[PDB]
Design a binder for these strands. Sequence first.
DNA 1: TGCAGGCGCGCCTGCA
DNA 2: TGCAGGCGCGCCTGCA
DNA 3: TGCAGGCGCGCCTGCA
DNA 4: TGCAGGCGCGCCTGCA
Lengths: 120, 119
Amino acid sequence: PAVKRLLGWKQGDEEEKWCEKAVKSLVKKLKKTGQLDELEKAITTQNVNTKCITIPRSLDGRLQVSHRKGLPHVIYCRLWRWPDLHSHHELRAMELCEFAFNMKKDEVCVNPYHYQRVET
Amino acid sequence: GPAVKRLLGWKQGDEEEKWCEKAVKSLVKKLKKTGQLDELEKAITTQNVNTKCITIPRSLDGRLQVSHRKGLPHVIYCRLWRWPDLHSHHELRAMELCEFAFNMKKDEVCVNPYHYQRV
DNA sequence: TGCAGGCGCGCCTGCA
DNA sequence: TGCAGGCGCGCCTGCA
DNA sequence: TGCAGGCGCGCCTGCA
DNA sequence: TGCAGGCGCGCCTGCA
Ligand SMILES: [Zn+2]
Ligand SMILES: [Zn+2]
């Protein structure tokens, strides 16, 4: 009771506010392209055989979320799988991943379960 | 909105939100024992600077440990309820009204966030 | 309900 | 020297 | 010198 | 509907 009341008054940190901004950014795109269910299926079931969850690729490959840039597959693999993920060099797509980042296609797959972490 | 909160619950960087709950649980347990919990809720919800000092015992080095993390008690609770980007105790100055301020080295340390001003 | 295991303050080490 | 961080004994908690 | 980060126009939201 | 304001991708800049 008092603990949960006092916790509600907590000033929110920028990292949690940014994570929410990162998830809202992806959800808005997936909703528009009919891919939101697949993201929830991939995240909650950890199923590697899920479809590619794609977003359009930018000219430099970077994605901006609340004044912060990063590679989109790296942003969402750090979010749902490896918080200590340093760079794209630590990621390796599976053969089944049609839209892997490394392939530089029109769309980029951000399904965290289509990438394997390597120790570079 | 429902999908965003659902998907957010699945994130991996949850090390900091479980800690804030442990930090609040730690303070509440001490304030209930000493009859000061209502004053904390009055200070937090009303932002009233003229609230009474909300004290906890002071340790030998002045640091407080919450779930394997150490910090100065007034800094911990000012960052929690007022300034998340609060860097160190050097950015805090107690109001003159505050009898149990951190810098006073007394037996009890006041952790009412509304008895400190940011500099 | 006895008791294994969690965790904090005090003690100590180790840099800048 | 201000500060960070590791870890044990004493205190406290939650099960079979 | 590669590349992180600043910032504007275009896009979009939201009031009157 | 005239207008304000938030923010990203594309463009551009400044360091270690
Ligand atoms: Zn894929
Ligand atoms: Zn005070």
